[PDB]
Design a protein around this ligand. Sequence first.
Ligand SMILES: COc1ccc(Cl)cc1NC(=O)CSc1ccc(C(=O)O)cn1
Ligand SMILES: COc1ccc(Cl)cc1NC(=O)CSc1ccc(C(=O)O)cn1
Ligand SMILES: COc1ccc(Cl)cc1NC(=O)CSc1ccc(C(=O)O)cn1
Ligand SMILES: COc1ccc(Cl)cc1NC(=O)CSc1ccc(C(=O)O)cn1
Lengths: 331, 323, 331, 331
Amino acid sequence: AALKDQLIHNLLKEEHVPQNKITVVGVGAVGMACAISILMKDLADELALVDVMEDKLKGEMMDLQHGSLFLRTPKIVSGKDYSVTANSKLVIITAGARQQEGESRLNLVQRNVNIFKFIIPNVVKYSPHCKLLVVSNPVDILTYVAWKISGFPKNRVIGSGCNLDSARFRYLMGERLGVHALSCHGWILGEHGDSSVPVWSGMNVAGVSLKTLHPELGTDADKEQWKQVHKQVVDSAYEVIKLKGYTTWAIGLSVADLAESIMKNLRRVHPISTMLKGLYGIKEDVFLSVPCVLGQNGISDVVKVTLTSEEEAHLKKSADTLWGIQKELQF
Amino acid sequence: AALKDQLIHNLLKEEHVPQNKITVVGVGAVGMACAISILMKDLADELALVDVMEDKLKGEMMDLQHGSLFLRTPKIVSGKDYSVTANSKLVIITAGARNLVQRNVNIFKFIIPNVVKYSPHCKLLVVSNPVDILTYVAWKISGFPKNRVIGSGCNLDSARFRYLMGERLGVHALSCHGWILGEHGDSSVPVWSGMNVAGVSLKTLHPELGTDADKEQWKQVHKQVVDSAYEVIKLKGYTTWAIGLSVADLAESIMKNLRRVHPISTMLKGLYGIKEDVFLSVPCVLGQNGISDVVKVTLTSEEEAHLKKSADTLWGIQKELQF
Amino acid sequence: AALKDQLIHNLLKEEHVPQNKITVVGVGAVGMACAISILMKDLADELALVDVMEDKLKGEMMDLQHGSLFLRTPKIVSGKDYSVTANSKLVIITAGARQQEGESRLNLVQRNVNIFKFIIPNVVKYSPHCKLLVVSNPVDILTYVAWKISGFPKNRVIGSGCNLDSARFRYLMGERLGVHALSCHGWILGEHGDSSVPVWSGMNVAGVSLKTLHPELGTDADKEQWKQVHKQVVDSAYEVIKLKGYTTWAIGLSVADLAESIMKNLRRVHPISTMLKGLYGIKEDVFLSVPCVLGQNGISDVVKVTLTSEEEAHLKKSADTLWGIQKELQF
Amino acid sequence: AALKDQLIHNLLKEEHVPQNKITVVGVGAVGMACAISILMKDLADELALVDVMEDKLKGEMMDLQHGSLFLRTPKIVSGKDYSVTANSKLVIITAGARQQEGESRLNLVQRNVNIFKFIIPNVVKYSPHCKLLVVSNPVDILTYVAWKISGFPKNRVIGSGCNLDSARFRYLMGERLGVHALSCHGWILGEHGDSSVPVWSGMNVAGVSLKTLHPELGTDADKEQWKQVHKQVVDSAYEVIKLKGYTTWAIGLSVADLAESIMKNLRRVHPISTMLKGLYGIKEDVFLSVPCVLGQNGISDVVKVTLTSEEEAHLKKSADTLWGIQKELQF
Ligand SMILES: COc1ccc(Cl)cc1NC(=O)CSc1ccc(C(=O)O)cn1
Ligand SMILES: COc1ccc(Cl)cc1NC(=O)CSc1ccc(C(=O)O)cn1
Ligand SMILES: COc1ccc(Cl)cc1NC(=O)CSc1ccc(C(=O)O)cn1
Ligand SMILES: COc1ccc(Cl)cc1NC(=O)CSc1ccc(C(=O)O)cn1
């Protein structure tokens, strides 16, 4: 008698189980950028959102849903309780607390750990086999904490690390050179942020080494000052926060790119943070960005970049600072 | 020589004239949502963003540029000076003021002649509320022929409706068809007679459809479409995602000359019993020249009178305003 | 040390299992158009091809493989042995014999059945849970046949049926009208071919009944002879064949469209062929095109279109004729 | 009143002229693969096909047309008469005469010169400002021919050159290394064919030079025999033809990638053949593959690769033999 039943004859009981499902944890400006980039790239057949801010949660979920005519991701859900995230191939974490002044690095990072003590177990319970991608800062350390708290093998716990910074360094590289970033190549590795290492030996267009053309590249004797480009990169995020109150669009597109490799098993290489104990001369349990082959199983391989000894030195110094810090956290 | 010069030999001295450029005026939640959707559908070779808050503007430009590696739109610019909108094929107006209209009219009195001076041949796509009026304002102030001035109108609301249709029937909104026309807002018309799946008229299956006696209360569905913007602002302060997607849908049809039919707001004098310079939503054919054709929807006599009611309502408001 | 091992440190042992695998059976021109349309729409993470022409089979593979820089489907495999199609989500059947002179159509039909008898049981073996999509002609019969041989439930066995006819119908509609096919709605239902049913009562633009606007629509006394539009649809595969010698592109795009709804669980409605014993006044075991909600479990519901009386008789007549062919067959 | 009139009210009585029109010359397998690849990448608002095979020409057009529901390219046209190609932004030449013997190079080539003598003038007549993209073999020679006949300036005449070959190389690379070709980088430059120059020096993953890791790379003493990878690239067109009768898909995909940089002004760098007199030591009017910046004005800049003295002389030899051939042609 109903309209649905008058119009439509049903022939198949539900058994609805998601196939390529993604969850974004945290619907702050970063998460929703991740959400929208992912939805517009068609990477999932179900997206789940989670956060503690129930009102903002339902609202974002509703806005995205009203866009369905324009999407090809048939189901969007959200909630306080993590069972809406059940059976994710990928779980992306952007949840954070924002630092007070005085607070101090250490206490800030311990509150975030406090968030992962609640957030990580819940994800793991409902998606034992998901890959985790952390974006929260500080990224290298909070990723380590996800690895520790989830009990996941290191290949399934990925840190967004220096993915966007590299993209960045390539856009600026392209601005100076006059070609598209897609065709500008360069890697920023190691610890995310100002302590990141710009591998000047690797930078090229068309396989043409720029440090060979221009031996002063990056060094302090450089008439063209290419180290300031790295600087621009490292500073560009605060600079944007300074100008619009936060950043979103780039980090989201950056995450969508990672998500695509994962969800499509592309085995592309990205500068993202992984557990590198053993490699690049690192002996502590620390996550850093190195070129990783990324796919349906997370990080499967690492490209061994030939670093100078000063670069090898840089990373080795981040491992210590990191570990020092992680050593002082309460799990 | 300089490293760029060691690396690259110039052979052509480059006449940079955008061929598929798009401008979004206003970088609030709405306009940015429009920008990010447009970038991601690969619709423009150039995007320009104009506003009046210069930091906010500069920082949105920078945030979008940083993602260039992941985009296929090679140039993104911004600034308070409208020289940056030069040569746009399409200019999207999301600017608006926190009675108002005359205030919004005042804003448009500044923005629109600027847009017209730098892109004489662009199409205007008004999104800011109150949208049927602001679209009339832009058209009047612009000097443009009417096909080149579009209101976003009932497009999104028709998207919401189909979404909700598809929740009650269990098929994707893509396969649920239903039109909302007229004044964008509480006084819009749910055209019951055209709601169908696979060409199967719901109203014929269920004549009570949309009536108060409707045991299924499909009338609530139109009310829910008319309330949802307000409901969503209530939850998260504003709305964005769905409006941006629907604007990019319109962008798409224009920049590829698809000639798709959308429920958008056009200067409909001479149609539907209407005799005023008003913009109302009707099924428009939409392409490289903006609105070029309108579908003449067959209406019940009440629906016909509801449209006339909104023409005179809109006209009455405009008669105050000064340009 | 091999260059590989020198460049890349392996951290995982992989046991590759494909997550969104699609197979196309038959690398004729229809199958290869399906193939390219799917690879360009990013619907699968692995694509496998099979045929009996082992050389044609290896050339198509390589040729696709060579386009990998431009694709996002990491893995493309091919072979005469169906081992290569294992664990497919969706298997598309474009295999078929072409006639002699000479032989009867009934006997050309049997010959195709003897191909399916060999092909279907092999697909089932390596992809028990796959959805079957049959494209080969005559499609309503061969879909039934794939159904009976497979022993699959009816939801998981889909005939491409009238989905292209309807797209053409809509394209030709928008030519007459000056609107894009996306915005013309009209349905071709029933049997694929000369006896299919243009449902005139449902033709519209923006929900405006052309029928109500013009009561002659589809009538013999129609000054505008819209009927001839149906005729063009029925004849268009033919007209195309006289001209270029086969059709490919259009059927290929339309197959990918059906593939996108399945792989993404969109639950859109398509004019496709399904086992409709029980509905539409059909008392026989035959496949006919009706509007079907199509998703990750194939056809889950169908929309019941109010047919005029002249129209029910067409479908019941088509069902009688099909059944009677189906009885003259050897499984 | 006509149904279309009852239904639609015309407001704009407007005109024609397309904004992003692309033409494909030649509806052989290569040009059609170019057609479908372009249509699924949403690169055009109008696509025109032209060829002398009138039936085949109209057949392909109609087959593409029937897929309009699924495309976002509103207008597809075809014709023996080049008025159909009017106002293209890009014109892709894939025409050619087929072998038989007595290919006194300067003869089977001479018959393609003569095909160009008819086609190019017709292209230039109706698309005065278009970009010319030549794919026909022999490509570097036929691109020069197109250049001389059209009278276009060098930036607007483009040969597909080694764009596809480098992509295959990158593909074979990713097979040896176990990453996607997207992440492997290397350049094949110079004369498209056996005499093309694999630039070993520039091969790399994530900026890490392979020839540095492994100095035998590309030499005979290479126990890994990476020299056979360049040779397998040179040969793969042949192998494929040997298997399937011709090659389509990869040349179609790569050409659509060039199309993309042009139509979007991306200024990406592609290994394509440009008129390079004055660069790379070459003093004759010839076309070679070097890294080119490709945008809305064609080839605007050229990346100067650092070459060995062997590579350089090798490029010179290709330049002098191309020229030797070009002198022997009749315009
Ligand atoms: C700021 O907290 C969150 C942000 C995003 C998401 Cl998705 C979830 C959360 N919060 C939680 O998941 C609850 S656990 C917790 C622990 C400490 C603090 C604090 O120091 O403020 C907040 N929550
Ligand atoms: C609210 O003003 C704007 C917002 C977004 C954009 Cl893109 C441009 C603007 N505003 C302008 O372009 C300057 S003209 C003007 C007139 C009145 C008011 C007012 O009522 O406060 C504001 N501006
Ligand atoms: C025409 O045969 C095929 C076409 C495409 C594919 Cl993928 C597979 C095939 N054929 C087979 O898989 C072998 S079984 C068979 C049965 C009858 C005939 C006949 O009547 O000529 C041919 N083969
Ligand atoms: C076969 O030639 C063509 C192939 C594709 C296209 Cl689009 C156009 C053509 N051909 C033409 O444009 C006609 S001119 C000509 C000159 C020489 C020969 C010959 O030596 O066989 C053939 N035609």
